[PDB]
Design a protein around this ligand. Structure first.
Ligand SMILES: [Mg+2]
Ligand SMILES: [Mg+2]
Ligand SMILES: [Mg+2]
Length: 684
């Protein structure tokens, strides 16, 4: 069940999906498509492999360098990084030129949702999360404490009062909103231009508020990243094709999903755009859906969805990132076109497609991404420059060369984002040989992470992002702890981030309040010109000093890390579920994703390498945490317990192998082990 398409031996499920579902309506001759795809693969594969080899070669050099330099000669270290080509010169100041970009990205500051593309139900909700009920968000979360079955009026009243107080912040009266006796320029029984329409529609900081006359709706997830990478499990052509079909469906605009509850079924569909009467009596139409990005995989992994003849290989698995650019690009044409075969809805209003590119190391790797995109646009007949790139700043070689990384994509970049979880994973792996690292929770307060976050913004603004491309920060992982999020996450817009990552539609609605409270444009303007971080700060390796930890602190870290690896991996391996809510050793429900795994496994691998803990301690902790995870999953009938037969569980062995072999994984990446182990489970 592979179709010969010249040099490509394509899994039929993929071949049929492309020819039967994706190609018609694109005006791309099917034979030209496969031939052109063959050629991109032939031409770009050697450079892809070469880039990966450079990764390994640099890491080998750093490992060796630390063998005797074990401490700290900062100057010698820095000059070594220069000599080996790890740290490259900063180019001169420039301004990005990226154009054809939507207003959601250039003009608006607000939340950005990330969702697993493989889950249609979740994807649909994510795309529809552009608008959400503040009342539902308040009532349904701990943002309104339970202090002091059916609706509860004493809660609803707190909800109403909270929204009222929010109204006084975002759309202030001339002379609280509470005292309003009714509404009719708008009148209530400060800035009159914040009345934009009715069907009552208000705008503050470029974001809409709708008061139903009853409820307050907030424009919430302005943009949404449909994720093929860390939040999904996709290890073969079957899984990939599920992902590509959902993405195709979102871009056609006809993705639907049946939802059955309480003996009733409703079909989930995409929301229409929203019409209003303007105050002059004219018409206004606003987007009903989040502007969609897609997160492709990075440069590392290969996929047997296509096996390749020619070049330097023998039926070589194709590079996954290459095929993601092709197939996510192809599907996204329908989100730009308006013919009969292209579905009822479009995504961009401006002729762009937005791909998030993760896990890139350094400017050559950004240049290669841009060439891939260029070659794909050629095969697809999209104008050059249509595939715009969201750059994840989440690898040390990228952070340290960030200005050159942006310049390498100056014509295509629509964001940068501090993917802080991967970035910490890379920090640990890169300096693995330097000595034992501080605890995961100490990393938050480290010199390097502070310079990483600040540099990103500075370099962004210095490259002229204000008004042209987002500057983003990272995910809030604690899904039930929304009072904490409303309290803490205001820090990101206050730091000049025009966007930050949220885990669900409800979190998007609550985080949107922060952008009403903080004028991110003015914050960005006050940041303009400032230089708040240094290369020497970034190069401060977060090594633990001696006598850093009482033995209980060591033990708390180990169990916490093992429980989190196990809770996430067991669902990954046994169920093919890539984004799980997993309760830590302190109880709290977290969004675990592959990057959370990278951090935990690398920290443990580092502690093992330097004798902070033993192999025996690791096994012991894993065995102790297994049944806790089994217990957490008990009410799920699809779950199979890991205990007591730990060595018969592929999931368990996968968690063990991530830690015990963690030091040998390229840059600490979890895919080689996880992909291997998921395939093993499927074939069992
Ligand atoms: Mg369409
Ligand atoms: Mg649209
Ligand atoms: Mg990441």
């Amino acid at each position: 069940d592979r179709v010969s398409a010249g040099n490509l031996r394509v899994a039929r499920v993929l071949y049929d999906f492309v020819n039967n579902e994706a190609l018609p309506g694109t005006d791309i001759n099917p034979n030209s498509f496969w031939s052109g795809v063959a050629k991109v693969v032939a031409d770009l594969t050697p450079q892809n492999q070469s880039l990966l080899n450079s990764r390994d070669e640099l890491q080998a050099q750093i490992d060796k360098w630390h063998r005797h330099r074990v401490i700290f000669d900062v100057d010698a270290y820095r000059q070594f990084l220069i000599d080996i080509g790890y740290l490259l010169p900063e180019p001169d100041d420039f301004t990005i030129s990226t154009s054809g970009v939507d207003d959601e990205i250039t003009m608006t500051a607000g939340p950005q949702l990330v969702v697993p593309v493989l889950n249609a139900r979740f994807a649909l909700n994510a795309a529809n999360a552009r608008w959400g009920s503040l009342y539902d968000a308040l009532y349904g979360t701990d943002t309104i404490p339970e202090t002091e079955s059916e609706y509860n009026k004493i809660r609803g009243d707190k909800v109403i009062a909270y929204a009222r107080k929010f109204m006084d912040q975002a759309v202030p009266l001339a002379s609280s909103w509470t005292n309003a006796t009714g509404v009719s320029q708008l009148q209530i029984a400060a800035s009159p231009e914040k009345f934009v329409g009715y069907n009552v529609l208000l705008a503050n900081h470029g974001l809409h508020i709708e008061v139903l006359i009853k409820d307050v709706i907030l424009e919430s997830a302005i943009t949404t990243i449909m994720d093929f990478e860390d939040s999904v499990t996709a290890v073969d052509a079957d899984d990939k094709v599920r992902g590509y079909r959902n993405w195709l469906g979102l871009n056609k605009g006809d993705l639907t999903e049946e939802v059955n509850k309480d003996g009733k079924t409703f079909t989930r569909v995409l929301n229409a755009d929203r019409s209003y009467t303007t105050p002059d009596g004219g018409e206004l139409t606003l987007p009903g859906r989040s502007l969609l990005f897609v997160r492709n995989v990075g440069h590392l992994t290969t996929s047997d969805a296509i096996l390749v003849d020619g070049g330097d290989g023998q039926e070589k698995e194709v590079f996954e990132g290459i095929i993601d650019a092709v197939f996510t690009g192809l599907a996204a044409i329908h989100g730009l076109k308006t013919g009969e075969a292209n579905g009822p809805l479009t995504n961009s209003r401006t002729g762009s497609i937005y791909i998030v590119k993760p896990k890139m190391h350094g400017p050559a790797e950004v240049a290669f991404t841009c060439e891939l995109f260029s070659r794909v646009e050629d095969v697809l007949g999209l104008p050059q420059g249509t595939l715009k790139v969201g750059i994840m700043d989440e690898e040390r070689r990228t952070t340290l060369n960030l200005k050159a990384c942006i310049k390498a994509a100056a014509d295509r970049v629509v964001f940068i984002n501090t993917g802080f979880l991967d970035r910490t994973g890379d920090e640990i792996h890169t300096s693995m040989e330097a000595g034992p690292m501080i605890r995961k929770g100490a990393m938050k307060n480290s010199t390097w992470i502070k310079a990483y976050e600040d540099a990103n913004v500075d370099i962004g603004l210095a490259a002229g992002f204000k008004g042209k491309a987002q500057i983003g920060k990272g995910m809030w992982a604690m899904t039930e702890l929304m009072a904490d999020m409303v309290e803490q996450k205001i820090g990101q817009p206050k730091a000049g981030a025009t966007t930050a990552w949220v885990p669900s539609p409800t979190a998007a609605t609550l985080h949107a309040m922060h952008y009403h409270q903080v004028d991110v444009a003015a914050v960005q303007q006050e940041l303009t010109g400032q230089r708040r971080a240094t290369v020497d700060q970034l190069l401060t390796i977060p090594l633990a000093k001696k006598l850093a930890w009482a033995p209980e602190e060591i033990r708390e870290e180990v169990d916490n890390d093992c429980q989190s690896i196990l809770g996430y991996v067991v669902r990954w391996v046994d169920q093919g579920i890539g984004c799980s809510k997993v309760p830590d050793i302190h109880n709290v429900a977290l969004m675990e994703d592959r990057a959370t795994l990278r951090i935990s496994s690398q920290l443990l691998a580092n502690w093992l390498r330097h004798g902070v803990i033993t192999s025996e301690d690791v096994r012991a902790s894993l065995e102790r945490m297994a049944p806790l995870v089994d217990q957490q999953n008990a009410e799920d009938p699809a779950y199979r317990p890991m205990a007591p037969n730990f060595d018969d569980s592929i999931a368990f062995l996968a968690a063990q192998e991530l830690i015990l072999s963690g030091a040998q994984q390229p840059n600490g990446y979890t895919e080689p082990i996880l992909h291997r182990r998921r395939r093993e489970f499927k074939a069992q």
